[PDB]
Amino acid sequence: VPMDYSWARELGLIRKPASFMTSICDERGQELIYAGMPITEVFKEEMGIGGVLGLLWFQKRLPKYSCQFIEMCLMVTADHGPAVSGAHNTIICARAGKDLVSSLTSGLLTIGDRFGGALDAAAKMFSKAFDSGIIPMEFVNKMKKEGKLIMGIGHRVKSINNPDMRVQILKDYVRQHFPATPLLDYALEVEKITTSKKPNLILNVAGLIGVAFVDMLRNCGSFTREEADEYIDIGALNGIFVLGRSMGFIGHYLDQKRLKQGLYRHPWDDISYVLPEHM
Amino acid sequence: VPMDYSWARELGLIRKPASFMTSICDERGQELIYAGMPITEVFKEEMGIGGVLGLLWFQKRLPKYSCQFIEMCLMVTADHGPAVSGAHNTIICARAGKDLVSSLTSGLLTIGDRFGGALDAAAKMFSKAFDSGIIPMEFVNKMKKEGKLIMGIGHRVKSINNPDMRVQILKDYVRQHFPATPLLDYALEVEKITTSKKPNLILNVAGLIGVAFVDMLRNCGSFTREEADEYIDIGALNGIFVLGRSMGFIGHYLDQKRLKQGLYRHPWDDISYVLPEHM
Amino acid sequence: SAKAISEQTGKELLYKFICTTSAIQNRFKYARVTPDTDWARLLQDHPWLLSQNLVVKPDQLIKRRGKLGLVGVNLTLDGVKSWLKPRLGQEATVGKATGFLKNFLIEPFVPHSQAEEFYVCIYATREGDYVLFHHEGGVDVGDVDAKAQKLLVGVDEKLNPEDIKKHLLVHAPEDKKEILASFISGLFNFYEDLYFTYLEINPLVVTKDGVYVLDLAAKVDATADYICKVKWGDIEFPPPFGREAYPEEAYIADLDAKSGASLKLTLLNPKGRIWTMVAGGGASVVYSDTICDLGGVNELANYGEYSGAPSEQQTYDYAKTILSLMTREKHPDGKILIIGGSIANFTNVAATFKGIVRAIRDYQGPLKEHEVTIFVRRGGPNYQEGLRVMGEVGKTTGIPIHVFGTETHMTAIVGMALGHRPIPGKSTTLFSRHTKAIVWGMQTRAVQGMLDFDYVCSRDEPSVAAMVYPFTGDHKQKFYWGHKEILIPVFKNMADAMRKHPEVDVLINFASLRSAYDSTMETMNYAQIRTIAIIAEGIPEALTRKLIKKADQKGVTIIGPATVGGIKPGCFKIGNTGGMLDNILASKLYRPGSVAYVSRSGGMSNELNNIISRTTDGVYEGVAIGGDRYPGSTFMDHVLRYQDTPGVKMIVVLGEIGGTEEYKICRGIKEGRLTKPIVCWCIGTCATMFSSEVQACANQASETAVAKNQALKEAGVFVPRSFDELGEIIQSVYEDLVANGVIVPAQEVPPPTVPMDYSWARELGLIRKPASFMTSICDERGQELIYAGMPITEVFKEEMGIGGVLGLLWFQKRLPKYSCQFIEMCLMVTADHGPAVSGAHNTIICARAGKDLVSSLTSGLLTIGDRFGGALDAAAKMFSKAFDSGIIPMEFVNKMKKEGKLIMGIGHRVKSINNPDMRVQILKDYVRQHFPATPLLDYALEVEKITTSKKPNLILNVAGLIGVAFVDMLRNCGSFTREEADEYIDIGALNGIFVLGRSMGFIGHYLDQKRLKQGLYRHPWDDISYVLPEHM
Amino acid sequence: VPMDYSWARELGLIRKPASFMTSICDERGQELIYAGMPITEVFKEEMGIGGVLGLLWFQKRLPKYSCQFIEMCLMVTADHGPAVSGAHNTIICARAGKDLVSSLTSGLLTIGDRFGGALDAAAKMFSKAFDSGIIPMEFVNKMKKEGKLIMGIGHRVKSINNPDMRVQILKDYVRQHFPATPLLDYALEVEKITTSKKPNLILNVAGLIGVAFVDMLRNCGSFTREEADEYIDIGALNGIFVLGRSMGFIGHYLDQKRLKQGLYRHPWDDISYVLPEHM
Ligand SMILES: CC(C)(COP(=O)(O)OP(=O)(O)OC[C@H]1O[C@@H](n2cnc3c(N)ncnc32)[C@H](O)[C@@H]1OP(=O)(O)O)[C@@H](O)C(=O)NCCC(=O)NCCS
């Protein structure tokens, strides 16, 4: 009989290369492990969602304030109403009778540059400005010449003396808990300059989350500079927004199912048909 | 040194179970193979997209009229405007700046029971009615008594002396080329009954396609009754509709990118906010 | 309605479907002879007539044939043939009408005498079926109503033979008594089972041999066709003896069966001048009486109506038919067309007037020399826009058309046309302000109109509490309460709605004719409902009688079928009564009045609303009992309710010809039960001196509208001189009541305003809303599907396959045939490449996880991008960038080498040289033979020469070949500019090409995994390298 | 000059029905609102991620123990290794160079009956058994007769005296904090019967989470029986698992991007090709 593959590997006679590599979880053992930490240790250490997220995304044991800040970031990005593109698509898919996964993924697929990407874009823009020695005024001028709006700046209604409440809560927590916030101070100077202009140009929730997340990565002690830069580059903040807004999208799906809304059909009056005459 | 897995397998000293089974395509050889037929043979036999679809989905070399009928079915389901749920979601995703795949999948995820599943539902309902000995009048009465509308019956405007053009074309082709259409005849009797009830209750494009596809599977000679029933049960007509409407969804994505439409947000006046007072 | 059938058809039905223990001979023994018949074939197929003698009768609904000489008794074959000639084929005048003889029936002769001829009759009335038997049958019965033994069989009860023994059969011999006791029972069973309304056998021969049916006059309920078609086959309803219908006259007969709209048209003399196109049966009748009242007796040409909300095409066909019939002669005096009609409740005036303007705009040629004058008076939904549109159409065409609205009298149009006037336990209270109703059926427009009426009536709560629709689950539908959005529940079952809304006391049934009976039966099982409104038209009379019997047993008031319903201003509105809110405000139907009216026609009820609003303080309550033969509630019921109602001070009755209900009103007045002023007018007074009408069905002189009007006039009822005087007499009665102080007119209080509808404002162009979406590839709004400006029928006619459809939908261009075939070829070569690639792997994993086709396909498709599937787009972009610059292929190769970038579309695993890639070879051969010019392909071929000189397997890939050939096709097919082709490449046309091609393979993999029934996949742990942090 | 639609709506001269209804979030006002609760009040009450989830999915202000239980449920379902179907698909998509959203959605689309649906299936099965009045022995016997394995019962390695640590943690929390756990006691009796069978037939994390979630819905006091039944029916537990596993899938994507793994192609030796000879 031909030699059995698994039992030969047990004897160590043959070698077959492993095609996959993982670093975040080990389920083979007697206990589930989250990046080197047993799940019983995860719960005993009073880790919340933030600690588990730190273990699974960064393979680090973040300090308690970092995990709490991550949880507040997920909370403030939970939902922003049904009018946005992702919530709209999720509601349409739910009203089409599809399951939770399909509707949620239909809503999530709209997340990218125009919708939901302001966190990552603001973080990248402010980090690139701050890493170079240009002062906030020079940053504003440079963004002006290149014809680029500063990501993370500008609110429809909120302004000076009418501050954004989510921004206020997150900023207050960051000041009382983060040991050092260089990028946040840089962004606050930029916000002062922009509010010297049209005064709704306040620091957005997206910009504040991006700069505070970069500050947390760079100043919590668990990361080197290269590690924080790599995690910003590969889209950790995109994951933060996606995970936060998944709660709101699932809530929208459940609300549409509970309200028993029928299949949606867009009105013809809201659509402008411009077709070729014969082509 | 330990034995080499691949070279041991070449020697045949060891066996490792294969975790995957496939039947539709072989790319390991000197030529690409579609369900037994080489690609050169596919192009030499003048088989089109319909023949390739037959090979890939049913592992059968279908007759020419069957492949042409499949092509017409894909043609008539290519697009039905931007107001439907899937096209709406694709347009929203495209206007959110996403790539072709993301927008197409966002649109496709709405395809299911309420949207796009009328082909499969009509085929299943009519096949179930025809397999039992009940007459078309008995089928209509049973559907009425069960509180179920007949899938594949009913048009928003079209009626007698105002026929659906796609239905007319498909029915004419099926009549002129299909050797036998028992289910189609049954559906036509049901349509006469329903149009006697109400003029606009004509046979839908979904119902026509479903019954004609079941007839094609059962009468082309390439399938047994069990094989055709299994292919209907596993969702072949769902795949037909999805493949057909994918062309329209990609067209809508390309149109939205050509028109350079900006990010869409649903108007607040079109949303009725009904929230708890304090809960 | 009940339609008479031929004697032959009744004989076939009786012989085929009777079931009795008696013996019936001559079964199926008859023949039909016609002027265009085959005598030899008739002798051959049925040769049993050679031996016995024959009897011959005309079979065109002829009564008293014995006394008119059209019957032949004791004639042989040659005698029958000789006797047929002098009468068949030409005039044979019978009574008032005359007509041709194109039908005769032949049956074997029977020997008998006057002592064995029996008369049997079964006819339907509201209380049930009357069976009359007379022992002295034959042609010497005379008056049989008060002579023969008469027995009543109630609704939904059986006829026992014992009752036949002791009542119906008391003047017959014992043996013939016994045989007739079974024959009559079988005949009654046959009458009930086949929904006959009238069935007369006279004479009926009973002797030692068996039962003989010589004659049979039958009228059957046509509306029961959906019940009895299987037992009727192709039944025919011969017209009454006289002149046959015109080819144009018979066209409305088949238009009537197309939809639920009523289309009636009858011709008397095409040589007349006045032609009527009145909307509404009651309105058409009123117009006919008005034209006959003031000089139109011998001048009228036609009578007809259109109702039931006819569509555009139906109205256009009716108008073109009537105009074509109008133009067939040149009258020296001229011609008049009268488009009359009352205010519509549901019929779209604009939809029924655009067809009119279309039919009078194309029909200009032979309609102008007759000097036709058109007078139009119409009201209802969208009446102002339709009137203005038809007026402007007439002014452009130049035909003289006089347009008048609801501000003028409905019948004044006739006067101006003829020149007489210048041309410028039942409850007395059914509804209240707190009345709540359940609507059976999905009628969003009707419920919204009801809510608007309630809001403008200052009701506290909506009158609709719930809706019942069995074809959807329980949910809530959003409606408007003024400017606020409210939710009305919809229940799949009536029981849940009944339980959750115990305060509902009214059901409005919008079920069809074939579902209204069962729904009403189920509704009467609940005692909380005291009033039911049946809207459906076409319910069989037997079912309606069963409904009436159950309602009387339960004490439930039924506003009979085929009605718009009724309106109680300030309290409640039924369905679509009174039109939309504009007519409600115009007729002041938001506040109670003091005049209560009852009518049969709904449109005539709306006309009464208008008349009472203009000439009186207003309507208190109006009910349309419907046009059915047996209404759920009669005129007397509502008149007694009005008399018992303190708020009612005057009663108006709009009766119709046929029946004796107005005589019941007269008797109620003479007995002192009715004391309030009553103004009643019976329409149809013009049907007395016409040839014959079909639209009611009076059978006596007392039932004529003239006789009923005369009796009411000499019974204490204020009867106007005509319908024109109805408003004047109503106003006179109201003014007298005001002068005596019984009526105190309340001061007018403005009603709450309702916001205008967005769609209606867009139709009038009063508001503008920006379109949030802009599309260019498909159009499904129109009558035909359009792909980028090209109809689907033309798409299939031009024989462009999937490639052409893709060209239309993606590029909005009609590509040449070779380009479409090349696109299909690209789709085919990228259909699948095995299960080992990332997308196929993910699709297979998702399929083995039990997910549906869409989820597995999307899971596979989401891997398509830079590393998998994007080689087509990358190769096209790189080669186009190299070619647009002037660099040579060698310079391109060197530039890519020094930039550390591999050339996309170059390099194969096993196919190097002398064994080329077969897909590449096929595509390249096709492109060479069919493409006009391929500069980028030649550039890529030079690059491939260089790379294969570097390494044999560095050949042009399928991805690179497809990319460069697609760019060449875009740039050289002539359908694109350079910028258009570059933009299409930039936005990802080739990504779409690959995705659409590989979707076929992914769906194939999903179906294959489902067929193989593969279980859940879990990746082996030995193939995964776990490198986790030690403690972090 | 046609009137503006917005102006006509402001004056109330027209009425246009709203095509959408929402109940979970209001963003039009001066502050973000989560089901009637201002975001400032949400953070002031320390509602946490579990509290925000309760507000957005159930429109209820759940007690602290229920919110914490929801957080632990999300924590225990965060990840279970890379070998499962969803993690495998996410890793494949990440190694294909796709973005975070695409890879996460590819992994999530495998969640359904066979993978990830054990929570909802176990909850439904145990609720149907407990609400029908049958005793645990009767339920076990009935499941055996119908040929259905009891969902939420049976572990690969863990057994009696070797309990699942996640199950122990969640069960301990539920016992000390939930007011009443009828369904949990019923499931524990069922597990006592199934451990008199093989020792490995213990209550899984899926079954324990399902029964504890049903118990929390039916016993926290914020829901009636109808509301809890509706929320279970529409797939609240499906959303719980999806949201929990989304963190692990994003972590897997980030890990694959950090390891810079190349494009994956499945080995041919692990695939068994069974193609038709010529069809
Ligand atoms: C962020 C930014 C778009 C600010 O928005 P803005 O253009 O000032 O205003 P908005 O686009 O939010 O909306 C404009 C108006 O539409 C209204 N509106 C918003 N959503 C709406 C909806 N769904 N329906 C109807 N109206 C809506 C707003 O109330 C606002 O009202 P007003 O102009 O009458 O006061 C702008 O400053 C910017 O682009 N900055 C870059 C920073 C960035 O991109 N961050 C994004 C943070 S998520």
Ligand SMILES: CC(C)(COP(=O)(O)OP(=O)(O)OC[C@H]1O[C@@H](n2cnc3c(N)ncnc32)[C@H](O)[C@@H]1OP(=O)(O)O)[C@@H](O)C(=O)NCCC(=O)NCCS
């Ligand atoms: C097929 C079926 C949906 C058609 O019934 P319907 O309700 O008359 O069709 P619609 O709902 O599309 O029409 C509603 C009206 O809205 C209009 N409408 C349709 N799409 C619209 C859009 N995007 N925007 C605005 N208005 C629209 C239509 O013109 C139609 O006519 P109306 O406005 O004159 O009343 C129905 O008979 C049915 O449910 N049958 C089951 C079988 C089935 O679903 N087959 C699949 C179809 S291929």
Ligand SMILES: CC(C)(COP(=O)(O)OP(=O)(O)OC[C@H]1O[C@@H](n2cnc3c(N)ncnc32)[C@H](O)[C@@H]1OP(=O)(O)O)[C@@H](O)C(=O)NCCC(=O)NCCS
């Ligand atoms: C196309 C290109 C990848 C050719 O690559 P290559 O290294 O020659 O060959 P592949 O990567 O396909 O595969 C290499 C080996 O794996 C083998 N192999 C392929 N699929 C396999 C599978 N699923 N299991 C096991 N072995 C496999 C091949 O047969 C070959 O084996 P060999 O060494 O025994 O011949 C390379 O030239 C390139 O990157 N060009 C850029 C242009 C481009 O990207 N084009 C896209 C291709 S359409």
Ligand SMILES: Nc1ncnc2c1ncn2[C@@H]1O[C@H](COP(=O)(O)OP(=O)(O)O)[C@@H](O)[C@H]1O
């Ligand atoms: N088959 C027959 N055999 C003998 N006599 C017949 C037959 N048919 C009709 N008659 C006689 O002709 C007379 C008139 O025929 P019928 O058509 O019944 O008259 P009507 O049309 O007035 O009812 C009847 O009195 C009947 O006796």
